[PDB]
Amino acid sequence: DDTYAGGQVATSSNVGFLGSKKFLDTPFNTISYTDKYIEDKQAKDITEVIAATDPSIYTNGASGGWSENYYIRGYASSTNDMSMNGLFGITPFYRTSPEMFGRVEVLKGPSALLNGMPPAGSVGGTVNLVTKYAADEPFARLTTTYMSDAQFGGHVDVGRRFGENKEFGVRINGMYRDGDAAVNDQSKESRLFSLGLDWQGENARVFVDAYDALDHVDGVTRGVNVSTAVGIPKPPKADTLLSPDWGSVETKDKGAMIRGEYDFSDQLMAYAAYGQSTTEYKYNGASAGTITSSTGTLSSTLGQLAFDVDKKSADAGFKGKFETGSVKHQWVANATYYNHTQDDYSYRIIPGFSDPVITNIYDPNPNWGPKPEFTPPFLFHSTLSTSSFGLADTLSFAQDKVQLTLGLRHQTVKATSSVNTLPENAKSATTPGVALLIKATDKISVYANYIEGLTKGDQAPATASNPGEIFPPQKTKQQELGLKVDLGTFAHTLSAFEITKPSSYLDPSKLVNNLPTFVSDGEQRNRGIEWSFFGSPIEHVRLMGGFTYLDPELTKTKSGGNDGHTAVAVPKNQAKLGAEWDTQVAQGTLTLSGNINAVSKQYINAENTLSVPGRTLLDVGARYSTKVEDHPVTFRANIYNLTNKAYWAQPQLTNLALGAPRTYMLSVSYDF
């Protein structure tokens, strides 16, 4: 079995191009969630999977935003930067419904050695989505879903293997759901069709995945801005929508990939992966609300955006083992390629609709005005290309009890834009990694790593002493020290880390030829301690979660103005706890569940003069699983934000947004 006691977490995960590694063999803080856990949470997106019990992950928790939004180790981790089966550029751009995945894997911290630079250059962590393939036994499950107030849905999952040796597999997933959600005047529509094909040969293997997805929100949440002069007013009740009720966002995503492996011997393997995807995004609504008085007056400017992006992606390489003296080597060498082309259509100012719409956030009957026709004109075409070449070796001493991993990767990046007159060139950087793992016993591992993340370099403006200079890719740097303990059915991780991340800015205090200079002297430093755990500490009980302390400090900022201040948006303290308790009832198993998610305050600006308080959220759940004439049936009921706590937290692009209100979810599932 791959799965740990309880069924919710897997025992191994993909560690970029080092491939599959077990929990106690992995000198990084990783976790992998099963499809069972996904169905048990009734998760509708990736955030609801990876944020529920992990204290190193934070979301502002808004309902029906234009994308998912989460941080890992106190840094942004962009939805653009998820991998599928280890390959970037395939998954949906902004929001991914998790019906098509057998695992959701999280690797905490930056990982450029392992993965290369993902398209948006975030460095918080890597989320890897592993698709489903057909199990040996024919399989068909139908599930009907409900989410308050009036969203109804279904999901069908069928699988079957063919050939004399079941060497071919086919796995199909289909999902649709539609209707009013828990926020007033907001509705959500989701559609997925997916396909997982595989062929197992004697010396060779091929895996194909393709999918078609739709995500649509009417009454999309955009959030709102505040100033120090006016203040942050008390949050309205939690089901309030503070963006136009006619506003909407729609993302269509299509993707396909193929992987191939060829075993030359038991010591040498080649592999290749190729994929492509398409994203069509449209948005019509507020570009931002602004709170203009302490009585709750709100001023919302309107904007429109569409973009189309075509992506291509590849990763090919060789893996091998050999021995020298009493040292075992496991090596890999790979090359990656990513390219996208993009068209952007946009109104900054919409004709007829440049006067902002004036409301009050506490109003039960806001007048949002008419809905402008959607006609954004073409603005610019843009491209992004990346490529990389990586080498690594894992050396093992003393019967596999000491493992030293060394490697490096060369990374190249180039961006173009059809409205940029400044020069456009590729830039490169070399990023090393080293990680040490010691097995004290066969139940206890201690580990340390140094590893980097990469972000494309900014370009100096025409106003600067160094006008049009393009910086090389910028290096985020992690040191980590950790301890892992597997007691058998229950496991612990304790880790400490320090991660520095640079930023770049125009600096009026460093004059060259009497002009401001563009520099990469900016720095944020996140130090943290994480204690987390999972599994079944007693019979019939499951328990997952942990506690983190995080110190996310702006150590160097423009002019020194904000030196020593705390980073925006993320909390310093998190405690999360998910529990499940099983009990035999009639002809089936009843499970009760509860979650608590407690966080401390967050700063809203880098001056640290505005903040929002901490908050504690509770969720409860019941689940009944039985057979009806010998067919497995599972009934599920959940309530999220049970106390209907109203809270502000920080999303992308704007200062504040309301967290999701109390939400009920029901589902029933039936195996044929």
Going by helix content, strand content and strand pairing, the class is mainly beta
Number of domains: 1
Q: Can you count the beta strands?
A: 39
Taken as a percent bin, the fraction of beta residues is over 45%
Describe, in plain words, how this protein is organized in 3D.
The chain is mostly beta strands and 672 residues long. The protein has one domain (1-672). Helix content is 2%, strand content 59%. It is built from 3 helices and 39 strands. The chain starts with 11 loop residues before the first strand and ends with a strand.
Set down the secondary structure blueprint.
Blueprint (H helix, E strand, L loop, with lengths): L11 E3 L5 E3 L7 E5 H7 L4 H5 L6 E2 L12 E2 L2 E2 L6 E2 L2 E2 L12 E8 L3 H4 L9 E7 L7 E9 L2 E13 L5 E13 L6 E14 L3 E15 L5 E2 L22 E16 L4 E24 L5 E28 L2 E21 L9 E4 L17 E20 L4 E16 L9 E13 L4 E12 L18 E13 L3 E23 L2 E21 L5 E16 L8 E2 L6 E13 L2 E12 L2 E2 L7 E2 L2 E14 L2 E10 L7 E2 L7 E2 L4 E9 L1
Parallel strand pairs: 7-10, 16-18
Antiparallel strand pairs: 1-2, 3-9, 4-5, 5-6, 7-8, 9-10, 11-12, 11-39, 12-13, 13-14, 14-15, 15-17, 17-18, 18-19, 19-20, 19-21, 20-22, 22-23, 23-24, 24-25, 25-26, 26-27, 27-28, 28-29, 29-30, 29-31, 31-32, 32-35, 33-34, 35-36, 36-39, 37-38
